[PDB]
Design a protein around this ligand. Structure first.
Ligand SMILES: CC(C)(O)Cn1cc(-c2ccc3c(c2)OCCc2sc(-c4ncnn4CC(F)(F)F)nc2-3)cn1
Length: 833
């Protein structure tokens, strides 16, 4: 390690938001072992990736072009405008034509490429132009394909700098210690020790209740019922203090297959006034305020059916993820495990029927896994694959076969599930995992995947003491292979977000909440912003939620502090790309304090719902705008241009006090349209966007909102916002919306009938991916939201998608829900006083 291999680690630390060489919060060397274990996968992907295709990161998809985009192509004829310097000429191209093919038909000096104007997006590679996402983007929104002809970026810029016993298990509980304990009166306290494995407690022992003081000693040997050999890899020694106050975990089998042995002083997590933070093997960094517990360990290892029963098994196999397996169910699944293995959909249930507390069985289970023919050959089922990666599975072998199926995902799809896959790292017993390496692998192989991997990881590192260490080692592994070029981009990005966040917080503190703003405030803002720009704001930076865009200089005149109780910064940038065809600013809202992780997840689920609707050839017109969570209750938002709140459109009127009126939405659309045809396209867009947001919002159970949290574009696109919070209504189908549909209380119409028809199609279309939706929702709650009910809410999703009903009831169930919105009118809306 030279002197210029040390000022590098300082650079990595500031890019991560955490120091991965800090060994202050460890009781073993797993984190360091994982840093070294990741060197091989890092260099293995860095060495097998094509410098040229990696430098341009073509965004492609292998899915068939949807019907709704085909009808936009009446001809077979796609137009592509090309520019040099000033002038330009248009060309008629076949949807099947390659970048190479279109190139030869333009010439009709052979090393030029097609970049998108204003963007860092490239139409390169041996793929039909119809198979480029940018092209597909243009076709939908009625935009025109514009490209500039320039030279491929130098792959040298991506260069990477060089590198270099039948005994029963027992634990002695020495005691628990805490510097300060007060509140109130005086209770009794005991230590609870669980032996866990995939949310299955295998055995459980308590101590005797002792008076609660700042030091409580026991010196007690807890002898469990599970033999040492019967301990499975990944099993956790879960220690908890009740009066439930504190918890902390200790992997019983370490990362070297060694039985944990010796003395340990663990600082515990407190419970804040079920959730994935309770599974972490990390100890509390805060050594001066946290409860600690002292233990001792001294005890290497892993060294044909009657028709009626089949019907039962099939019934079992047929149930939803959330349907609890009975003792009866589990014994049946196990006993018929070779038959159960022929059904990929039974795997989660089958591996949950396994008694992991017994060696002979785990072994038989591993035998089961070596005869993995059906699973290997099955088509990739993301939902099936995600279930095996949640909190219910700690066996690395079971989990490895899910990550196996993930290997066959193309980058398009990896981008779809990147966020929840990154969150899925929390369910891994160990820091080094096939899932972790997968992320690392795909992230180094593709710049777009790498870019988002960076922010998703950096997001968690900034606001999760429970999992920041693990994520920090992983991010470091990525940053040591992404290349000098992106190391520079990220640097630029991190520089800018941190500076603006100081400014966002310094402005919020200056102004008292409610009055509002507030003139000095607007002046000081422009001043801080003047200070940052000369100097030094990075001259240009990638928009984190849209790596293609490079924001440039601020437009300080358009920048302001918004009129909300939380003082969000409204920032506007100039596009740093000169070749851009538009003169629009890049709009960004910087805001504390919403928990924008909830917004990130929800939004991503929305994007998943779109891809689901794309499979059935549907377009419900969603606007899953850009949103990155950057720290604790703080992040950035994309500003959708010319969009207003529904509530702002009602208060175009004198009355105030939420005296809402029915006709306005349709007028607002009429003013904002130049022609009447565009108005008609806005009405149509509204009917689709409203239908889409009614269905998804109902499924996710975030359908009951105030019209301050629902927005519409001047182009007629409806969409929800502000998810990071959250009599009764299914969703928002307010009378003002219906009026745009040509109804107002108890009537119907050719646009409303359309609305009702599209919802049911959309609704039934999501139910074909029920399992995937359930598992994502369930995961979202565990890793993204405040401590919840590891029953009830997940249970609400079951009901919403009407699990176990025929398609007919569901169509009506949803039609009933539309009517509940009609029967309530403004009631719920008016209440949102
Ligand atoms: C950009 C203009 C000048 O053409 C028109 N304009 C747009 C906005 C606006 C306001 C808020 C948002 C926005 C365009 O983009 C749409 C996406 C979202 S999400 C969101 C949000 N999430 C959580 N809280 N909020 C609102 C706030 F940022 F105020 F906290 N706000 C916006 C206001 N005027």
């Amino acid at each position: 390690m030279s002197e210029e291999s040390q000022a590098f680690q300082r650079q990595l630390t500031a890019l991560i938001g955490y120091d991965v060489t800090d060994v202050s919060n460890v009781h073993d060397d797993e984190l360091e072992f994982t840093r070294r274990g990741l060197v091989t996968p890092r260099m293995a992907e860095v060495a097998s990736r094509d410098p040229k295709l990696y430098a341009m990161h073509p965004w492609v998809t292998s899915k068939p072009l949807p019907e709704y985009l085909w009808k936009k192509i009446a001809n077979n004829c796609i137009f592509i405008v090309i520019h040099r310097s000033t002038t330009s000429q248009t060309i008629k191209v076949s949807p099947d034509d390659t970048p190479g093919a279109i190139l030869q038909s333009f010439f009709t000096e052979q090393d030029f490429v097609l970049r998108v104007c204003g963007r860092d997006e490239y139409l390169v590679g041996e793929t039909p132009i119809k198979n480029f996402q940018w092209v597909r983007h243009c076709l939908k929104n009625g935009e025109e394909i514009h490209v500039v002809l320039d030279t491929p970026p130098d792959p040298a810029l991506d260069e990477v700098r060089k590198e270099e016993c039948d005994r029963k298990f027992r634990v002695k509980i020495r005691g628990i210690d805490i510097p300060v304990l007060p509140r109130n009166t005086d209770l009794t306290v005991f230590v609870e020790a669980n032996i866990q494995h995939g949310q299955q407690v295998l055995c459980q022992r308590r101590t005797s209740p002792k008076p609660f003081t700042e030091e409580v000693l026991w010196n007690v040997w807890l002898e469990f019922s599970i033999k040492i050999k019967d301990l499975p890899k990944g099993a956790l020694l879960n220690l908890q203090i009740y009066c439930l106050l504190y918890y902390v975990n200790l992997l019983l089998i370490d990362h070297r297959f060694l039985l944990r042995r010796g003395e340990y002083v663990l600082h515990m997590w407190q419970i804040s006034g079920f959730n994935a933070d309770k599974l972490t093997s990390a100890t509390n960094p805060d050594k001066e305020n946290s409860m600690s517990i002292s233990i001792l360990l001294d005890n290497h290892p892993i060294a044909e059916m009657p028709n009626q029963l089949r019907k039962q098994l099939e019934a079992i196999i047929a149930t939803d993820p959330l349907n609890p397996l009975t003792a009866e169910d589990k014994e049946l699944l196990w006993h018929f495990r070779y038959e159960s293995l022929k059904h990929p959909k039974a795997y989660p249930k089958l591996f949950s029927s396994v008694k992991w507390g017994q060696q002979e069985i785990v072994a038989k289970t591993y035998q089961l896994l070596a005869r993995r023919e059906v699973w290997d050959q099955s088509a990739l089922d993301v939902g099936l694959t995600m279930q095996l990666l949640d909190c219910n599975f700690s066996d690395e072998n079971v989990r490895a076969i899910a990550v196996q199926k993930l290997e066959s995902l193309e980058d398009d799809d990896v981008l779809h599930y990147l966020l929840q896959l990154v969150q899925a790292v929390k369910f891994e017993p160990y820091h080094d995992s096939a899932l972790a390496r997968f992320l690392l692998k795909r992230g180094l192989r593709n710049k777009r995947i790498g870019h988002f991997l960076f922010w998703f990881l950096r997001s968690e590192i900034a606001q999760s003491r429970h999992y920041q260490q693990r994520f920090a080692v992983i991010l470091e592994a990525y940053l040591r292979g992404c290349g000098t070029a992106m190391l520079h981009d990220f640097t630029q990005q991190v520089q800018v977000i941190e500076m603006l966040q100081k400014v966002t917080l310094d402005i919020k503190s200056l102004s008292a909440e409610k009055y509002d703003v507030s003139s000095q405030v607007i002046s000081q803002l422009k001043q801080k912003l003047e200070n940052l720009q000369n100097s030094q704001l990075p001259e240009s930076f990638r928009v984190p939620y849209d790596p293609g865009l490079k924001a440039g200089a601020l437009a300080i005149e358009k920048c302001k502090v918004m009129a909300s109780k939380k003082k969000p910064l409204w920032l506007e940038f100039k596009c740093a790309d000169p070749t851009a065809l538009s003169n629009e600013t890049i709009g960004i809202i910087f805001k504390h304090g919403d928990d924008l992780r909830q917004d990130m997840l929800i939004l991503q689920i929305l994007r998943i719902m779109e891809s689901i609707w794309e499979t059935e050839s549907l377009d419900l017109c969603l606007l899953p705008y850009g949103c990155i969570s950057t720290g604790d209750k703080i992040g950035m938002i994309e500003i959708v241009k010319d969009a207003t709140t529904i509530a702002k459109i009602q208060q175009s009127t004198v009355g105030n006090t939420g005296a809402f009126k029915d006709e306005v939405l349709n007028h607002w659309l009429k003013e904002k349209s130049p022609t009447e045809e565009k108005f008609q396209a806005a009405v149509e867009r509204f009917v689709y966007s409203c239908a889409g947001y009614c269905v998804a919002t109902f499924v996710l159970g975030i359908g009951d909102r105030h019209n301050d949290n629902i927005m519409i574009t001047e182009t007629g696109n409806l969409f929800h916002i502000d998810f990071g919070h959250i009599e009764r209504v299914p969703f928002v189908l307010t009378p003002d919306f219906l009026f745009v549909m040509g109804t107002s209380g108890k009537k119907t119409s050719p646009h409303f009938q359309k609305f009702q028809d599209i919802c049911v199609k959309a609704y039934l279309a999501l139910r074909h991916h029920t399992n995937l939706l359930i598992i994502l929702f369930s995961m979202m709650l565990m890793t993204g939201m405040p401590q919840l009910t590891s029953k009830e809410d997940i249970e609400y999703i079951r009901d919403a998608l009407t699990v176990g009903k025929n398609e007919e009831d569901a169509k009506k169930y949803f039609l009933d829900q539309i009517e509940v919105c009609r029967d309530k009118g403004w009631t719920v809306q008016f209440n949102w006083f």
